[PDB]
Swiss-Prot record:
(S)-thalidomide binds at H62, W64, W70. Disruption phenotype: No obvious phenotype, however mice display increased BK channel activity and a subsequent decrease in synaptic transmission and presynaptic release probability in excitatory synapses. Mice also display cognitive behavioral defects such as abnormal passive avoidance, hyperanxious behavior and decreased preference for new objects. Treatment with the BK blocker paxilline rescues all synaptic and behavioral abnormalities except for hyperanxiety. Brain and synaptic morphology is normal and long-term synaptic plasticity is not affected. The CULT domain binds thalidomide and related drugs. Thalidomide binding leads to a change in substrate specificity of the human DCX (DDB1-CUL4-X-box) E3 protein ligase complex, while no such change is observed in rodents. Belongs to the CRBN family. Component of a DCX (DDB1-CUL4-X-box) protein ligase complex, at least composed of CRBN, CUL4A, DDB1 and RBX1. Interacts directly with DDB1. Interacts with KCNT1. Interacts with ILF2. Interacts with TRAF6 and ECSIT. The chain holds residues 322 to 427 of 445 of the full protein. It is found in: Cytoplasm; Nucleus; Membrane. This is Protein cereblon. The lineage of its organism: Eukaryota, Metazoa, Chordata, Craniata, Vertebrata.
Length: 108
C-alpha cells in the first residue's frame, strides 16, 4: 500500500507504515539543550513494526535515546539491519517501547 515502508533489500517485506510514525522528544524537562548522542535525523521512530527479528537482549550502553534500552532489529527475510527496538528503563515513561528505524534501510 501507499503507506507501506518496506525493507529496501528484499522489497516485499513491510517493516512499518507511515501511520505508525511519531515524534519523540529528545529533550528532558523544560526542553533543555542536549548534546546530540547518536544520529537521530537518519532514524525514523514508529510505535509499531513488523517482520523483524530481535537480536540479543536489551542494552542501555550508549543509547541514542536516553531512558531507553536498545535491541538490534533485522529483517526476518533477508537479515538486513533495519534498526532497533527501544524499551523504556522506567515504568513512568511513554511510549514504553518504540522502534528506531534507519531511513535509508527502507523504501520509500
Ligand atoms: Zn529484507
Amino acid at each position: 500500500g501507499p503507506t507501506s515502508l518496506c525493507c529496501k533489500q528484499c522489497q516485499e517485506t513491510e517493516i512499518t507504515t507511515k501511520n505508525e510514525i511519531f515524534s519523540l522528544s529528545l529533550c528532558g524537562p523544560m526542553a533543555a539543550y542536549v548534546n546530540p548522542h547518536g544520529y537521530v535525523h537518519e532514524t525514523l521512530t514508529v510505535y509499531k513494526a513488523s517482520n523483524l527479528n530481535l537480536i540479543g537482549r536489551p542494552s542501555t550502553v550508549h543509547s541514542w535515546f536516553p531512558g531507553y534500552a536498545w535491541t538490534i532489529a533485522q529483517c526476518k527475510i533477508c537479515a538486513s539491519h533495519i534498526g532497533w527496538k527501544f524499551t523504556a528503563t522506567k515504568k513512568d515513561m511513554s511510549p514504553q517501547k518504540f522502534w528506531g528505524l534507519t531511513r535509508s534501510a527502507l523504501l520509500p
